[PDB]
Structure 1
Amino acid sequence: KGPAVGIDLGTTYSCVGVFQHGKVEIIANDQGNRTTPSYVAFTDTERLIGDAAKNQVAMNPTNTVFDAKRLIGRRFDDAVVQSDMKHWPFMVVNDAGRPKVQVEYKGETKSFYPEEVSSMVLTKMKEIAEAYLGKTVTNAVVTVPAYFNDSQRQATKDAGTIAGLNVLRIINEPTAAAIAYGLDKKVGAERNVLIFDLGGGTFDVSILTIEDGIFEVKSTAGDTHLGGEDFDNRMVNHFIAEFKRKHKKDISENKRAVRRLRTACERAKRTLSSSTQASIEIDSLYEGIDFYTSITRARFEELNADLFRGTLDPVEKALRDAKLDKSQIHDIVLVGGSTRIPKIQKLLQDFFNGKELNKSINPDEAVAYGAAVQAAILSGDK
Structure 2
Amino acid sequence: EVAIGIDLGTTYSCVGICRNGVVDIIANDQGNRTTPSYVAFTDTERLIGDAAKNQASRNPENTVFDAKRLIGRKFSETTVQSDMKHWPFTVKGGSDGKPMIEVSYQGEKKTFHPEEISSMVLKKMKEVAETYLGKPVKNAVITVPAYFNDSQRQATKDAGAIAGLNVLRIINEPTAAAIAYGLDKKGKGEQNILIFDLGGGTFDVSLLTLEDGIFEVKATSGDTHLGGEDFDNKLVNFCVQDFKKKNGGKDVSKNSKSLRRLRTQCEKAKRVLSSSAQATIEVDSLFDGIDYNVNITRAKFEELCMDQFRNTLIPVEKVLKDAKMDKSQVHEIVLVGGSTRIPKIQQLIKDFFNGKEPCKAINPDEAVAYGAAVQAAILSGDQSSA
In structure 1, distance between residues paired with 2:210 and 2:65: 33
Unaligned residue ranges in structure 2 (runs of 5+): none
Aligned residue for 2:254, secondary structure, equals coil
What residue is the counterpart of 2:313 in the other structure?
312
Q: Tell me, in whole angstroms, the C-alpha distance in 2 between the residues paired with 1:325 and 1:110.
A: 52
Q: 2:377 maps to what in 1? A: 376
In the TM superposition, 1:302-341 aligns within 5 A as 302-341=303-342
1:130-167 deviation line (CA, Å, top 9, x unaligned): 11121111111111000011111111000000000111
- Alpha-carbon deviation of 1:97? 1.5
Q: Distance in 1 between matches of 2:342 and 2:280?
A: 16
Q: Does 1:82 align with 2:103?
A: no
Other-structure match for 2:260: 259
The amino acid of 2:60's aligned partner reads P
Matched-pair contact (CA < 8 Å) for 1:147–1:220 = yes
Q: 1:289 to 1:181 in 2, by over 3 A?
A: same
Contact kept? 1:186, 1:213, Cα under 8 Å: no
Q: Note if 1:169 corresponds to 2:175.
A: no
Is contact 1:186–1:212 with CA below 8 Å preserved after alignment? no
Distance 1:79 1:290 in 2: 41
Letter in structure 1 aligned against 2:340 = T
Paired with 1:288 and 1:33, the residues of 2 have a C-alpha distance of 33
Match of 1:9 in 2: 8
CA deviation string 1:244-272 (max 9, x = no partner): 33344321122222212211111211111
SS in 2 for 1:332: strand
Cα drift, residue 52 of structure 1: 1.4
**Structure 1 stretch displaced more, 41-50 or 114-123:** 41-50
1:35 maps to 2:72: no
Cα distance in 2 between the residues matched to 1:246 and 1:97: 49
Given the alignment of the two structures, is residue 60 of structure 1 paired with residue 59 of structure 2, yes or no?
Answer: yes
Matched, 1:138 2:135: no
Using the size of structure 2 for normalisation, the TM-score is 0.95
2:337–2:364 contact (8 Å) kept in structure 1? yes
Query: Structure 1: which 5+ residue stretches go unaligned?
Result: none
Residues 298-307 or 131-140, more deviating = 131-140
1:21 Cα deviation from its structure 2 partner = 4.3
Percent of pairs identical after alignment? 75
Corresponding position of 1:119: 119
**Whole-angstrom CA distance in 2 between matches of 1:284 and 1:372:** 45
Please give the root-mean-square deviation of Cα atoms over the aligned residues, in Å.
1.5
SS at match of 1:252: helix
**Residue of structure 2 equivalent to 1:93:** 92
The alpha-carbon deviation at position 301 of structure 1 amounts to: 0.4
Question: Which residue of structure 1 aligns with residue 215 of structure 2?
Answer: 215
Indicate yes or no: 2:66 matched with 1:72: no
Contact 2:188/2:213 (<8 A) preserved: no
Provide the rounded CA distance (Å) in 2 between the counterparts of 1:58 and 1:160: 28
- Distance of 1:302 and 1:125 partners within structure 2: 37
2:339 & 2:371 partners in 1: Cα distance? 19
Counterpart Cα distance in 2 of 1:317 and 1:367? 23
- Amino acid of the residue matched to residue 120 of structure 1? M
> How big is the shift at 1:187?
4.2
Quote the residue 2:183 is aligned against. Answer: 183
- Report what 2:281 is aligned to: 280
Distance in 2 (CA, whole Å) between partners of 1:168 and 1:186 is: 25
Q: Which residue of structure 1 lines up, in the alignment, with residue 152 of structure 2? A: 152
TM-score with structure 1 length normalisation? 0.96
The separation in 2 between residues aligned to 1:64 and 1:324, in whole angstroms, is 44
